[PDB]
């Protein structure tokens, strides 16, 4: 183990420090034997995932907050969690030498650093991007016979994607999302603006449209790696907005509906790809439950349908029990998944703010409202960005958890970081969440989850000022005896009979 070099920009924590010979680190991944805990807490003060262990007890007197877990009452199956190599992630992180590009690597993808299984891949080019491009930009290419993958991909994200791959021991599983067609396949002809594709689902520009998803997933195929998963088209109700600043298309539900009933979901269906998830929306969450009315209320499109993607705006407020409750409700066999979330996007607001644990706990508070609202797994956006936020072509810069500073050959985890790791790190791939029911009235956010091999896994988030004495009760096995510490997250483990 290597503990966080600390420092401090003047905001209300503080990052840790890496370069080419330090990175704070966890030593290998082990449970502590029967009848113990383990808990790891970071706070505002400056703890960083910091391990330490106590007993798990047989009895428990106090009229304390108690919080039961209910290991019976099952939720949903989690997927993962991960972040974006959008080209801006690529850049940023081999601008580093090469010892701090591993190490920043391992921090994301190793058992020595926060576990994450899931890659997203953006299809060319998107604002996270210093030159716009489609991988099919010879125009009336209907047969694609021009498709070909640029350097950005061939020479940046594929063979940092192969590394990630190369450290992780947890399978890695991708995603896939387009944010512009080719200009030629456009009602209006540019890569951004008002904008969407031409004719109509069933004909030329839409069969083109869905072999570029399979000529895609055939060219990465061809650099051995294969997809989980494809969203249906990054934020389709961007592209409907006049003046929209940079790379999309636009797709009313009805008309995302259609092509997937039409064109996407068939062409997949007949492509070695076939066993690809096909995941509509990729949006925000106020176009539900209206988006998922309208695709899967349709059996042609619902058949080709696995699963919803949402986006979340951290910077903005939107009812979650409005929008995923009463998706789950409606439609409760189809999966929800967060493929992309973001603070610091709004114009005045500092794109970086360095050692921000409000921003932290915006990460935490997310991932906990997602996981009690039925959500598979959590996607963060770039993985990596310059203390400006970018490079970003419209200057539309945004934070990140990690944040590279090249003229130093330094790069500074973000609070961002350990508020996410502290769900990464210990949610592998196929934990059930369970319930965890409060004795009282209280100010903590939480969520209980189940390992494939039984384990428990409990995250305490404390947004407030006071420090919050509390028990956990595991029935079958006994009584946690801990405390929240004013502005803490604490994750813990243990051993179930
Ligand atoms: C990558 O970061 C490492 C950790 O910051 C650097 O290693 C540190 O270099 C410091 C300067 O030589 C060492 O001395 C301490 O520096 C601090 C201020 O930064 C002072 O307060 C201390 O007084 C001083 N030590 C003592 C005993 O007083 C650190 O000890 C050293 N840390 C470690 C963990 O080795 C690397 O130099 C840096 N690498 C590169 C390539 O830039
Ligand atoms: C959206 C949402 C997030 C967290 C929660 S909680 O973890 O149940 N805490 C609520 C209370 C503060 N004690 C519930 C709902
Ligand atoms: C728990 O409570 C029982 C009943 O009062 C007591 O006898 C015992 O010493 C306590 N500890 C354990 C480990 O059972
Ligand atoms: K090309
Ligand atoms: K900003």
């Known amino acids: 183990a290597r503990p966080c070099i600390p420092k401090s920009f003047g905001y209300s924590s503080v990052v840790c420090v890496c370069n080419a010979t330090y990175c704070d680190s966890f030593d290998p991944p082990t449970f502590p034997a029967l009848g113990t805990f383990s808990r790891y807490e970071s706070t505002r003060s400056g703890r960083r995932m910091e391990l330490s262990m106590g007993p798990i007890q047989a009895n428990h007197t106090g009229t304390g907050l108690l919080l039961t877990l209910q290991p019976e009452q099952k939720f949903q199956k989690v997927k993962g969690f991960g972040g974006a190599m959008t080209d801006a992630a690529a850049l940023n992180i081999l601008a580093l030498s090469p010892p701090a590009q591993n190490l920043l690597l391992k921090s994301y993808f190793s058992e020595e650093g926060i576990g994450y ?7 060319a080019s998107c604002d996270f991007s210093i030159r716009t491009y489609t991988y099919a930009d010879t125009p009336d290419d209907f047969q694609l016979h021009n498709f070909s993958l640029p350097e950005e991909d061939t020479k940046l ?11 992780a021991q947890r399978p890695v599983s991708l995603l896939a999302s387009p944010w512009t067609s080719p200009t030629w396949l456009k009602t209006n002809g540019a890569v951004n603006g008002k904008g969407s594709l031409k004719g109509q689902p069933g004909d030329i520009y839409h069969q083109t ?3 570029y998803f399979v000529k895609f997933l055939d060219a990465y195929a061809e650099h051995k790696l294969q997809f989980w998963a494809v ?21 009313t539900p009805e008309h995302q509906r259609d092509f997937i009933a039409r064109d996407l979901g068939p062409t997949l269906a007949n492509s070695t790809h076939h066993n690809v998830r096909l995941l509509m929306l990729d949006d925000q969450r106020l176009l539900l439950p209206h988006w998922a009315k309208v695709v899967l209320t349709d059996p042609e499109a619902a ?13 903005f407020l939107a009812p979650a029990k409005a929008t995923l409750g009463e998706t ?25 703010r360095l050692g921000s644990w409000d921003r932290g706990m915006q990460y935490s508070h997310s991932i906990i409202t997602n996981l009690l609202y039925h959500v598979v797994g959590w996607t963060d956006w770039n993985l990596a960005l310059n203390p400006e936020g970018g490079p970003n072509w419209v200057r539309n810069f945004v ?3 990690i944040i590279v500073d090249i003229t130093k050959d330094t790069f500074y985890k973000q609070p961002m970081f350990y508020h996410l790791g502290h769900f990464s790190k210990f949610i592998p791939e196929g934990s059930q969440r369970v319930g965890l029911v409060a004795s009282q009235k209280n100010d903590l956010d939480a969520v209980a989850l189940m390992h494939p091999d039984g384990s428990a896994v409990v995250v305490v988030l404390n947004r407030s000022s006071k420090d919050v004495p509390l028990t956990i009760k595991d029935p079958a096995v006994g009584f946690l005896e801990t405390i929240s510490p004013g502005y803490s ?7 179930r009979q």
């Not at 299984?117 to 953006?122: A, D, G, L, M, Q």
């Not at 969203?231 to 797709?251: H, I, W």
């Open 303 to 315: 058949k080709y349908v696995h699963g919803i993607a949402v986006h979340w705006y951290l910077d």
């Open 489 to 495: 997250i604490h994750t813990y483990l243990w051993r």
């Open 231 to 251: 969203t249906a088209e990054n934020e389709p109700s961007a592209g409907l907005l006049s003046g929209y600043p940079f790379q999309c298309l636009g797709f």
């Open 399 to 401: 934070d990140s958890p």
């Open 328 to 352: 789950h409700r409606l439609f409760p066999n189809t999966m929800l998944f967060a493929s992309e979330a973001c603070v610091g996007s709004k114009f005045w607001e500092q794109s970086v």
């Open 117 to 123: 299984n899931i890659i997203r891949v953006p299809m």
């Open 157 to 167: 994200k594929i063979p940092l994607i192969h590394r990630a791959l190369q450290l």
């Open 209 to 211: 449209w869905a072999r």
